[PDB]
Amino acid sequence: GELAQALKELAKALKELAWALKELAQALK
Amino acid sequence: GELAQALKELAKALKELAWALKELAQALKG
Amino acid sequence: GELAQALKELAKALKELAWALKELAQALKG
Amino acid sequence: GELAQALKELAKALKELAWALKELAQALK
Amino acid sequence: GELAQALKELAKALKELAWALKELAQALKG
Amino acid sequence: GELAQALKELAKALKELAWALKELAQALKG
């Protein structure tokens, strides 16, 4: 219910955080 | 539940971490 | 309940980190 | 059982992470 | 359980984040 | 199980962030 929806919301953020990390990795070379 | 409520505040905080890192990334690229 | 308040707390921790990294980011772009 | 022990292990790390954050805050002033 | 196993790998990662931030803190203080 | 692999994944995310911040830290101390 309300928790399966909260869980994909965490899934989205987790992807978002990865993308930012690749951007910062890129920025450090 | 209140667990779900928790996961919701964590997803919100991850998102702001993600934004901050992109901000930091750009700060360094320029 | 066992776990909810531990994940809520990790959310505040990351939120603080995000603010921390915006300040760092600001310091570096000047 | 094994999960109540894992949970205080997360509790410890959470404290540890806070302490590092105050150190970095300190470092930025 | 496998949930507990998860919380264990998260506590381990928080600890290394904590170390990295202190490393970053010192990098800036000097 | 629902949640385990999401928290395991957040652990890898933070581990990567910690490595990211060690590199940043190294870049700044020279």
Numbering used by the authors:
A (entry chain C), D (entry chain C): 1 to 29
B (entry chain B), C (entry chain A), E (entry chain B), F (entry chain A): 1 to 30
What wording appears in the published article?
By contrast, those of the βL class and peptide CC-Type2-LL showed weak or non-specific binding of DPH. And LL sequences form collapsed structures. Surprisingly, the X-ray crystal structure of CC-Type2-LL-L17E overlaid almost perfectly with that for the parent CC-Type2-LL; i.e., all six Glu-17 side chains are completely buried within the core of the assembly. However, the cognate structure for each sequence did not always have the lowest score, as apparent from the off-diagonal white and blue points. This occurs for all of the LL-based sequences and those βL sequences observed to form collapsed structures. For these, we propose that the collapsed states are adopted as they lead to more hydrophobic burial and contacts.
CCs are quaternary structures comprising two or more α-helices supercoiled around each other with cyclic (Cn) or dihedral (Dn) symmetry. Here, we describe variants with all combinations of the aliphatic residues, Ile, Leu and Val, at a and d to give four classes of peptide: the ββ class, with a and d = Ile or Val; Lβ, a = Leu and d = Ile or Val; βL, a = Ile or Val and d = Leu; and LL, a = d = Leu. Peptides are named systematically appending the one-letter code for the amino acids at the a and d sites to “CC-Type2-“; e.g., CC-Hept becomes CC-Type2-LI. In summary, solution-phase data and X-ray crystal structures demonstrate conclusively that different classes of Type-2 coiled-coil (CC) peptides—i.e., based on abcdefg repeats with predominantly hydrophobic residues at a, d, e and g—adopt a range of distinct states.
